[PDB]
Design a protein around this nucleic acid. Structure first.
Lengths: 84, 70, 204, 120, 50
RNA sequence: CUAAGCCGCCCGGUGGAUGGCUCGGCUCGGGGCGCCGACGAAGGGCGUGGCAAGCUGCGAUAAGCCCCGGCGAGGCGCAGGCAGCCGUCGAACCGGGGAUUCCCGAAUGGGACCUCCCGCGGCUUAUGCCGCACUCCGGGGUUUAUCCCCGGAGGGGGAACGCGGGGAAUUGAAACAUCUUAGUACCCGCAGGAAAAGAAAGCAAAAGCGAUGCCGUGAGUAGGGGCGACCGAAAACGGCAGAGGGCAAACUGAACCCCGGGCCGACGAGGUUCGGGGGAUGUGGGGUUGUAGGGCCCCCGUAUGAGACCCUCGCGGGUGAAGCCGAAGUCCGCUGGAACGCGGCGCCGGAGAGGGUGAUAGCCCCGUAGGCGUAAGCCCGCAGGGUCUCGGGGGACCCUGAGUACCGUCGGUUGGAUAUCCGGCGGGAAGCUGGGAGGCAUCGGCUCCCAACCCUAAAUACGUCCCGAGACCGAUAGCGAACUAGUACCGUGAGGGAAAGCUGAAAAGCACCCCGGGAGGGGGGUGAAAAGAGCCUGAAACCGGGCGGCG
RNA sequence: GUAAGGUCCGGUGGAGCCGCCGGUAUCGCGGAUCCUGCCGGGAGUAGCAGCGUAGUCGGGUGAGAAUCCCGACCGCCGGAGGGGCCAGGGUUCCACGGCAAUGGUCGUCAGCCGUGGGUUAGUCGGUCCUAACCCCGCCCGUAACUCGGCGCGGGGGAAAG
């Protein structure tokens, strides 16, 4: 659903974040706000989001760290997405 | 997908299919960035053009329904 | 051309030539007849007068002379045409020639008359020329052959159009170039009875 | 189709920049005498299945099936007209369709049959 | 430099992405005809237009 | 058997001339097409490809999406690769119509030191949509605030051409001030595919012509000019093209116009009716002219008839996108890597224009000579339904453009010379028993006209663009750009602005062996020829070796 | 051939070219401190000092080490050559793999080349306020404007207040 999410980030730093801090790393569309990213994640993956941080990379794309609540596992979502 | 089969389905099914195609397109872009065994490099293109077809036919159905109702 | 460049002269003092040069690196020379990329000193101009005029009476006299020469023996042979099989000069043909509109029929008629040899000679002489004309569409430099003159056209131009180097001209629109190609008089010509009568009426 | 200009520059410009649907008609080859008598058509565009005999080139007289067709280059590949690579592999020589004759037509296409009907 | 407007940052990002070599497969496809493009840049020597 | 050095020949290196080639330029009689924008233009920013940097194209549906038609087996741009996918349920491609169309930009709800931000109201459950700039026009409300609501305009762009204003100097006069340069460069404003002009208070006098515009000519003439340098027309005549109409007033007096709705008609034309807004400070009817014209009045007759125009519920025809047909050898021998070549034997020709194809080809392919088809649109016609127009004589009554014509003075402009035109200042009529022009002023005669209100096609000017052509150029030439060119680069800025084409018929682009850290070298293969990618030819300068001469 | 030149013989080249007659032209090169491109002697020469003269010994890496890495010793700045952080720069940041070119010598090294990655805010700053000052609307002037301007209404204006 929605156009907020462009692609998951499959970098080693992202994978470490998934393993440790229950965080999923996404590359999303620039005009999206933090509420938009939170709502998109919650609706698409049926998970509860605890926090959202955003930045704009030197390439001009928006990257979002979405920290999920302890009740849901980010590893499960990564496996569902094929992140491994 | 073909325009005929897209026209066969209803607007709600078109929206659902659009959502599924968007999610799959995101998944495949992530997989492309991750791995190197690109068995089907054209999946992204096919999904994107199918999305375009679905949206176009949805707009056509909306316009024709409005014209018929009016 | 060569006048779109902004230049500033270095002037005296520098160990160079007082030549206009560009204001940006590498500061080349520009806008000079002797500077690379500059204008040409005295180039061609579209306002030049190329049309030449000749008096109507003088043109008529020249056409008369050309028609008189077309019936000569020494000049026609000296031009290059082969006239071995021609019955006589001038070669006058009956009005029937004006109603033929098939190239094969005209070929057979010309074979019988004795000019097919000249047509073949023209075809052989036509060939690829030398120079830049090939770029501009002048690859072939075609030769001339017999000239068909008729008093009235009802198919003869279509019939004899395709033979290499032959022109079919109605007597009314007959010009000096038709009879003296390249300024060389003595072109092999075949006339018609009606064309000859019209020549008699006009006196030329 | 009309190319009316008698200027080589425009002729070659049209040849090189022609669209694909026009290049389609630029890949026609003459038919054999028997096929010409049977179909009353002098030439046709060449498909892949058509049998072909070569006239000009180092492979003149060779017969085979049309392997490849390239509209962009106006070329075709015919079975048996091959070259030996240094390593020892077989490649296909590109042959202009004008140097080919169709000794057998693969006419499973109703549109091709329509073309034959129209031209006959 | 430390504080940058978003539009200027995006323009710098576009220039950075622009600056890269010609793909080797593109060179092969063109048969060694296309090797370089005018938009190559060295940060210390060739400065951005902005 | 002389070391360095010099000249000459050969080979090699360096370089890129010459030669040949050309999908690019330049020029041009004729032909076609000529505006885009608040229903958000042009220019630009940023994004968009599986591998993707430049160019090109597209816009979060992002080298694309959908529908009708043409073509008929390949396709996925410049751009020759890997992988894969799309297509016979007709792709690619082409012509027509649609959908999407980020941000800035006239940019417009308010702001820009960054093409990004902050706002206010209805609808919506909410998602998410619809409204809100300034200067005005036609209406409504009230709060009378130009405050609110409905409808509608202007804004910016366009290579050259057009219309209206402001307006220099170098330069020439062999100096320089009147003058010239010049109503030019340039500036401000305003339109279109053309613009402007255009129908006589005109032109001419043995006669007369009869709107405007353009060309030839009048003509370096009349005429202006420190009468110096120089500047400089019109009429007539011959041509292109042809076309003429409406107001103000006399008279009548709401018989009228626009917006929305209804009804009869065909869905159109037309007719009729209701509400609202205008209108007696005049909507509509009539009327547009010179020894006169028109209103009104009077008299005779006419209209019965004859036009002209509007619409297409309907029909026929022409033209009109992609596009389709279109004759004749791949017949023997020779050279050749390969026949388009040479010799022999043939054929078509309304087609011997031009191009490609492994050489130079009428008959191998495209095409030409000549013909055909086409949705929408446009044009013509048939038929039906409507609207509208049309005669002469007399008058003594009424009307016919005001700070206007014109006079004096000052500035500009002009060939306009006491006799061009425009403008300022101060004066300023007649007005039909009237008025104006006829090259100093006034008087009389004669001739020609009726200003001070408005519109007007075709003949013309231009070429961003499109067909066609060439005694133009052939990569230091031709446009600056034959190519990822107004690109890279230089300057804070205004702005300035390059260099750079060619393997071969086919990559057949060197498999394998020895040496080397590598780059690469030597064998060996491909090719007719390395033409070996640092690739058609390979000059000169310059450098190294051998050879011959001197030393 | 008095000549401007022409023509023949022997090589390379692989595709066009010429005699004669009559016309046309950007029609003939040593200079213009001429223009564009290439290449010479100067020359294997100057420079690689002066303002802070800095390296050495063992070991490692690597085909190759004065120049790269570790230990020790000797040194230099030490009111900056140390620490923190603007404007400007714009990926120069980090790891790994490299040395065709760049680095005043060399190079296994790098601010170089190739491949992947890196910037997380209610509290820090912009965002808010206003200062010098600027803009827009009305208004007046100007032949006119994108020009000049007083007075009213509105808006902006500080990354060190």
């Amino acid at each position: 659903p929605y156009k907020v999410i462009i692609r998951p980030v499959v970098t080693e730093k992202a994978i470490s974040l998934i393993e440790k801090e229950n965080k999923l790393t996404f590359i999303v569309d620039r005009r999206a706000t933090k509420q938009d990213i939170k709502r998109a994640v919650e609706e698409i993956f049926n998970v509860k989001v605890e926090k959202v941080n955003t930045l704009i990379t030197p390439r001009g794309e928006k990257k979002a760290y979405v920290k999920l609540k302890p009740e849901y596992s980010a590893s499960e979502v990564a496996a569902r997405l094929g992140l491994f | 997908m073909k325009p005929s089969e897209i026209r066969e389905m209803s607007i709600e099914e078109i929206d659902a299919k659009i959502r599924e195609l968007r999610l799959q397109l995101a998944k495949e872009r992530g997989l492309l960035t991750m791995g190197t065994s690109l068995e089907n490099p054209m999946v992204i293109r096919n999904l994107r053009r199918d999305i375009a077809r679905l949206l176009t036919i949805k707009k056509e159905k909306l316009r024709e329904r409005e014209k018929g109702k009016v | 051309a060569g006048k779109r460049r902004v230049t500033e002269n270095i002037g005296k003092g520098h160990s160079m030539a007082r030549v206009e040069r560009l204001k940006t690196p590498p500061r080349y020379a520009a806008f000079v007849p002797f500077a690379r990329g500059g204008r040409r000193t005295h180039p061609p101009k579209v306002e030049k007068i190329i049309w030449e005029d000749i008096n109507k009476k003088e043109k008529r006299l020249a056409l008369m002379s050309a028609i008189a020469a077309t019936a000569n023996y020494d000049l026609v042979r000296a031009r290059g045409h082969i006239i071995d099989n021609v019955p006589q000069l001038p070669l006058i043909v009956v009005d029937d020639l004006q109603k033929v509109q098939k190239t094969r029929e005209t070929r057979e008629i010309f074979k019988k008359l004795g000019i097919w040899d000249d047509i073949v000679r023209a075809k052989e002489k036509s060939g690829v020329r030398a120079g830049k004309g090939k770029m501009r569409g002048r690859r072939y430099k075609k030769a001339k052959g017999p000239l068909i003159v008729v008093g009235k056209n009802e198919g003869i131009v279509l019939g004899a159009r395709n033979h290499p180097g032959v022109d079919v001209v109605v007597v009314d629109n007959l010009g000096v170039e038709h009879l003296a190609p390249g300024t060389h008089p003595g072109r092999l010509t075949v006339w018609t009875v009606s064309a000859i009568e019209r020549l008699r009426e006009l006196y030329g | 189709m009309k190319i009316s200009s008698k200027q080589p520059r425009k002729q070659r410009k049209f040849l090189y920049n022609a669209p694909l649907h026009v290049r389609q008609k630029l890949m026609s080859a003459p038919l054999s005498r028997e096929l010409r008598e049977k179909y009353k058509v002098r030439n046709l565009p060449v498909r892949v299945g058509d049998k072909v005999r070569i006239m000009r080139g180092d492979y003149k007289g060779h017969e085979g099936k049309v392997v490849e067709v390239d509209l962009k280059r106006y070329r075709i590949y015919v079975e048996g007209a091959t070259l030996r690579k240094t390593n020892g592999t077989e490649v296909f020589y590109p042959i202009h369709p004008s140097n080919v004759m169709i000794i057998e037509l693969n006419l499973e296409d109703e549109k091709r049959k329509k073309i034959i009907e129209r031209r006959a | 430099a430390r504080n940058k407007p978003l539009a200027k940052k995006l323009r710098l990002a576009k220039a950075l992405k622009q600056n890269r070599r010609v793909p080797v497969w593109v060179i092969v496809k063109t048969n060694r005809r296309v090797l370089t493009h005018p938009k190559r840049r060295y940060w210390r020597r060739t400065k951005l237009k902005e």
